[PDB]
Structures are given as C-alpha cells and as structure tokens.
Amino acid sequence: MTKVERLLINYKTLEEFKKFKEYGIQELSMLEELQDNIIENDSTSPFYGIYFGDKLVARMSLYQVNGKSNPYFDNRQDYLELWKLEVLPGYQNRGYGRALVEFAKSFKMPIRTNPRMKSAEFWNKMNFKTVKYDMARDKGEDPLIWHPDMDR
Amino acid sequence: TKVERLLINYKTLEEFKKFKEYGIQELSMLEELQDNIIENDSTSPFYGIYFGDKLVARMSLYQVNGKSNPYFDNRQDYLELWKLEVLPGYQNRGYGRALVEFAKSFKMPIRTNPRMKSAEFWNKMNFKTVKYDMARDKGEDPLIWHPDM
Ligand SMILES: CC(C)(COP(=O)(O)OP(=O)(O)OC[C@H]1O[C@@H](n2cnc3c(N)ncnc32)[C@H](O)[C@@H]1OP(=O)(O)O)[C@@H](O)C(=O)NCCC(=O)NCCS
Ligand SMILES: CC(C)(COP(=O)(O)OP(=O)(O)OC[C@H]1O[C@@H](n2cnc3c(N)ncnc32)[C@H](O)[C@@H]1OP(=O)(O)O)[C@@H](O)C(=O)NCCC(=O)NCCS
Ligand SMILES: OC[C@H]1O[C@@](CO)(O[C@H]2O[C@H](CO)[C@@H](O)[C@H](O)[C@H]2O)[C@@H](O)[C@@H]1O
Ligand SMILES: OC[C@H]1O[C@@](CO)(O[C@H]2O[C@H](CO)[C@@H](O)[C@H](O)[C@H]2O)[C@@H](O)[C@@H]1O
Ligand SMILES: [Co+2]
Ligand SMILES: [Co+2]
C-alpha cells in the first residue's frame, strides 16, 4: 500500500534528486527555474515518485509525446515517454518500480522507454517489448514499448 | 588520425561484442546479414580505428534531418554521433579524440547524447550542453558542437 505521488519542486526535493544516479540537465534547469521565479516553489513537474517515511525513495518522469512525428505505434498515435525510473539502494525489488510503472499504464496510453542495459529483465516483467530497430528513427537508443491489450 | 569506415560482416560484428554500448542496432545488423537482407561487406554508420587487426575504437555517425530536430540555428541538418567508445587498455591514447575529430572534419554541426562519467572528455572536445527543453529532450542530456567560422 505504497502510493504514487506527483512530486512538487522545491530545494528540499531537488536535494533528494541528487541521491539518484540518473541526474542531469533536467535537474539543473529545474533548479535554475526555481531560483529565477519564486512563484514556482512548490509547483509540479513531470515527476511522480514514492516516499517511505518522508524520504523520496523512487521516481519517474512522464511526458506525452506527439506520435505523428515519432513513428512508434499503430498509425502514429501519441504515447507517454517514461524516463528516469529509479529506486534508491535498500528499497529495490520491493515493488516500487512496478508500482510506478503500473501507474503510467493507468493512463491507458502506449508507453516508450529507453532503459539501462543492466535492467532489461525488469522491463521484461513489465511486459515491454523491443522495437524493430530503425536507424533513422532510433539512432543509438534501444527503445522498449508497451500498449493497452498487453499487460494492464 | 587512422579512422576507417567499418564494413558489416560476421568478423567485425563479432568484434562489436567486445564493446559495452552493444544493443539492438548490432542485433538488427546480424540478422539482416544472416537473413540475407544486406550484403556481406556492406557499409554502415560505423567508423572505427584498428590496432593490429583488432578493432579498438568505434562510433556511429549519421546525418539527421534538422527540420524535425530543432537543435541548431536556422534548423539546419547535423550529424548524430553515438556509441562512441574505446576498449580498455587503449583509453586516453587519442583514439576517442581521433574519431570525434574525424566527425568534426566535415564542418557540420554535431549532436551527441553522452555517457554518464564521460562528461570531462566531451568538454575537452568543446561540446556544449544544450539549454534543456523537456518536450524536445526528455531525459536525454544532449551535447552539441558546431564549427566557429
Ligand atoms: C530497475 C529498478 C527501477 C527496479 O527496482 P524495483 O522497482 O524495486 O523492482 P520491482 O520490485 O518493482 O520489480 C518487479 C519485479 O521484477 C524483478 N526485478 C526487479 N529488479 C530486477 C533486476 N534488476 N534483475 C532481474 N529482475 C528484477 C523483481 O524480482 C520484481 O518482483 P517479481 O518478478 O517477483 O514480481 C531499480 O532497481 C533501479 O532504480 N535500478 C537501479 C540501477 C540499475 O539499473 N541496476 C539494476 C540492477 S541492481
Ligand atoms: C572517453 C572515451 C569514449 C574515448 O576517449 P579516449 O579515446 O579514451 O580519450 P582521448 O585520449 O581520445 O581523449 C583525449 C583527452 O581527453 C581526456 N580524457 C578522456 N577521458 C577522460 C576522463 N574520463 N576524465 C578526464 N579526461 C579524460 C584525456 O585526458 C585527453 O586529454 P588531453 O588531450 O588534454 O591530454 C573512452 O575513454 C571510453 O570509451 N571509455 C568508456 C568508459 C567511460 O565512459 N569512462 C570514462 C573513461 S574511464
Ligand atoms: O503525512 C502523511 C504521510 O505522507 C508522507 C509520505 O507520503 O508525506 C510525504 O509526501 C507529502 C506529499 O506532498 C510531502 O508533502 C512530504 O514532504 C512527504 O513527507 C509522510 O510525511 C507521512 O508519513
Ligand atoms: O583496404 C583495406 C581492406 O582490408 C581490410 C580487411 O581485408 O582491412 C580492414 O579490416 C581488417 C580486419 O577485418 C583490419 O586488419 C584492417 O586494418 C582494416 O583496414 C578491409 O576492411 C578492406 O577491404
Ligand atoms: Co585518413
Ligand atoms: Co560549439
């Protein structure tokens, strides 16, 4: 009974993000936006996460992509790009990731993700499938996909 | 530099398995080769550098349509650089640079999505971080280079 929350942006949460490995420019810019406009302290972001106690313990970033110019699904439908899916050490294999994933699935929209190489078994379980490689489209990503009428 | 266009064949496809950034690209190529789709010794977006008859470094380079990829001024086209890598025992000897410089030699802008810890090398190649655009980037951390005329 560990629920998914939309994460609010603030110095505290940005501090939490530094504990995650998949940290990069999204985080840097978030910080920059916050220090430039106070009105966006305690605002929402593309991130959803799970908390144990009051520590952020697992996160995931979500955005709906225009499928018209990203040909992944049947006759070019929009899908959710899922990224930065991560659970801190000491809290893995406990189902937080699966919980975050099924949350994304609750939107009843196709999903694309570009995972880590040493965590492909986890996605096998989430019932995602490898795309057919298209060098012009995929260019050195190894995208995984999912759509309704696969694994709820 | 001693850079070279890599030719697809079981021999070099085997050598690829020595590199860590190995995925579906290679997998697609292997079956395309063996299912007779492509021809033996056909070209690829890969370029590489040998030491002896051992493939030591490689990158995949491809000209991208800048219309649907707004990364540079006046939506011009650019080359996507990826899977760039050098085998252990050969790192920090110039091979990596040699490839990046081969790419740069065509005077087109270059975009690459780098590997975690490799930040410091890219900085030495004068690649710069794009001002992050969530809709465009989505948890990529793109780096761009363009020639300064
Ligand atoms: C990938 C990651 C998001 C999943 O962790 P998690 O959400 O707590 O895992 P879950 O409990 O939700 O996984 C669902 C199921 O898949 C399995 N699974 C999870 N991690 C796995 C692993 N890395 N290898 C093989 N199977 C795995 C689990 O056994 C789990 O239970 P079930 O199959 O019995 O139903 C998380 O471990 C992470 O943040 N990764 C860390 C860095 C990394 O990529 N390393 C992976 C190896 S440690
Ligand atoms: C970075 C990489 C892709 C190719 O680069 P390379 O061929 O090994 O390095 P090069 O000799 O061509 O780079 C030339 C310059 O980059 C610098 N450089 C390369 N890797 C570096 C690093 N990890 N940290 C600091 N500087 C680095 C070299 O010090 C050298 O600097 P100099 O000209 O001022 O003396 C290669 O190291 C690699 O495939 N490693 C993969 C593992 C990884 O990502 N970790 C980083 C290296 S341990
Ligand atoms: O207060 C009840 C319960 O909620 C927790 C964890 O779910 O609160 C966390 O989530 C809140 C939702 O916005 C955050 O405001 C808060 O920072 C975070 O702790 C726990 O604190 C508590 O057990
Ligand atoms: O023009 C070079 C010619 O020779 C080949 C092999 O016959 O050489 C390349 O590949 C070899 C390993 O497969 C390397 O030993 C060699 O250094 C490299 O040039 C062909 O690629 C090419 O037809
Ligand atoms: Co030459
Ligand atoms: Co530049």
Swiss-Prot record, chain A:
Signal peptide: none annotated. The keyword Cytoplasm does not apply. InterPro entries: Acyl_CoA_acyltransferase, GNAT_dom, YlbP. PROSITE patterns: GNAT. Gene3D superfamilies: 3.40.630.30. Transmembrane segments: none annotated. It holds the Pfam family Acetyltransf_1. It comes from the Bacteria. Residues 7-151 form the N-acetyltransferase domain. Keywords: Acyltransferase, Transferase. GO terms for molecular function: acyltransferase activity, transferring groups other than amino-acyl groups. Its EC number is 2.3.1.-. NCBIfam families: PRK13688.1. This is Uncharacterized N-acetyltransferase YlbP. It comes from Bacillus subtilis (strain 168).
